[PDB]
From a paper:
Chalcone isomerase–like (CHIL) protein is a noncatalytic protein that enhances flavonoid content in green plants by serving as a metabolite binder and a rectifier of chalcone synthase (CHS). Rectification of CHS catalysis occurs through direct protein–protein interactions between CHIL and CHS, which alter CHS kinetics and product profiles, favoring naringenin chalcone (NC) production. The chalcone isomerase–like (CHIL) protein family is noncatalytic, yet it shares a “CHI fold” with CHI. The protein X-ray crystal structures of PpCHIL-A and VvCHIL reveal CHI-type α/β folds with high structural homology to each other.
Two CHILs are studied that represent distantly related species in the lineage of green plants: the lone CHIL from grape seed, Vitis vinifera (VvCHIL), and one of two known CHILs from the bryophyte, Physcomitrella patens (PpCHIL-A). PpCHIL-A and MtCHI-I have a high degree of structural similarity and align well to each other (C⍺-based RMS = 1.213 Å). This structural superposition reveals that PpCHIL-A contains a potential ligand-binding pocket that is analogous in some ways to the active site of MtCHI-I and complementary to the shape of naringenin, as it is oriented in the structure of MtCHI-I. Within the putative ligand-binding pocket, the tryptophan (W221 by VvCHIL numbering) is highly conserved across green plants with the notable exceptions of the two CHILs from P. patens, both of which possess a leucine in the same position (L188 by PpCHIL-A numbering). In summary, the structures of VvCHIL and PpCHIL-A suggest that PpCHIL-A may possess a binding pocket that is suitable to accommodate naringenin. This structural hypothesis is consistent with the observation that naringenin binding to PpCHIL-A has a stabilizing effect, which is similar to MsCHI-II. Supporting this idea, analysis of the VvCHIL-binding pocket reveals a pocket volume of 20.8 A3, whereas the volume of the PpCHIL-A–binding pocket is significantly larger, calculated to be 50.7 A3. The X-ray crystal structures of PpCHIL-A and VvCHIL were not available through the Protein Data Bank (PDB) prior to release of the AlphaFold predictions, and indeed, the PpCHIL-A X-ray crystal structure shows significant positional deviations when compared with the AlphaFold-predicted structure. A significant error in the AlphaFold model occurs in the β-hairpin motif abutting the ligand-binding site, which has significance in understanding protein–ligand interactions. The protein X-ray crystal structure of PpCHIL-A reveals a binding pocket that is analogous in some ways to the active site of MtCHI-I, and molecular dynamics simulations have revealed that the active-site architecture of MtCHI-I directs stereoselective ring closure of NC to form 2S-naringenin instead of 2R-naringenin.
Author numbering: 3 to 209
The structure:
């Protein structure tokens, strides 16, 4: 259709991020989590969008089982992440959170990924501090939208809006290519914080 339910939240099947020139299709969706004293709680609804052509860049995976694709060392993750097409994630907050803890968690997770790949130099460290600082003054209540748009492979346009509206302008830009790739790896990599979104995406490509 034109609208899909992700955790009873409406996600459009097609979407142009703020200030973008290109219509992106909904490839997969899922959720991310949080915990309180080991109890698992649903934190956000996620939708992963990309230029329709991403399907053709990944033709070679057609007809493989989804379970093959998401398995470690399959190679699919990196080819998904590196597909030379525009991509975006739309996040809809399910459990409200202050902006500092969210930005610090993001920083922590992106650092871990960059460190684990020997890519965490002073440039990446500064870019992450400034990303965390962007979020620190905001509150992210239930229903808030966060859009990350990979307009170029080395850049991420970050935009935010209240429930019911998409953002009109870009609020923040990530200018570091390694951070930009780490942010995609956060959602689509072997150690993804959202296995459900990755499983949804792989299904969509394999079929």
């Amino acid at each position: 259709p034109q609208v899909v339910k992700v955790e009873d939240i409406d996600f459009a099947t097609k979407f142009t991020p703020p200030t973008g020139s290109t219509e992106l299709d909904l490839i997969g969706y899922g959720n991310t989590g949080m915990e309180i004293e080991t109890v698992e709680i649903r934190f956000t609804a996620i939708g992963f969008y990309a230029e329709p052509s991403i399907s053709e860049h990944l033709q070679k995976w057609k007809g493989t089982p989804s379970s093959n694709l998401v398995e470690d060392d399959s190679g699919f993750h990196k080819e998904l992440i590196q597909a030379p097409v525009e991509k975006a994630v739309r996040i809809s907050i399910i459990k409200g959170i202050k902006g500092l803890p969210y930005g610090s968690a993001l920083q922590s997770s992106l650092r871990d990924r960059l460190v684990n790949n020997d890519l965490f130099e002073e440039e990446e460290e500064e870019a992450l501090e400034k990303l965390a600082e962007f979020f620190q003054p905001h509150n992210l209540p239930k229903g808030t939208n966060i859009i990350y748009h990979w307009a170029t492979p080395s850049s991420v346009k970050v935009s935010l809006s209240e429930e019911g509206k998409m953002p009109e302008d870009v609020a923040y830009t990530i200018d570091d290519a390694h951070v930009a790739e780490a942010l995609l790896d956060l959602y689509l990599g072997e150690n993804t914080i959202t296995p459900s979104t990755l499983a949804s995406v792989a299904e969509a490509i394999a079929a």
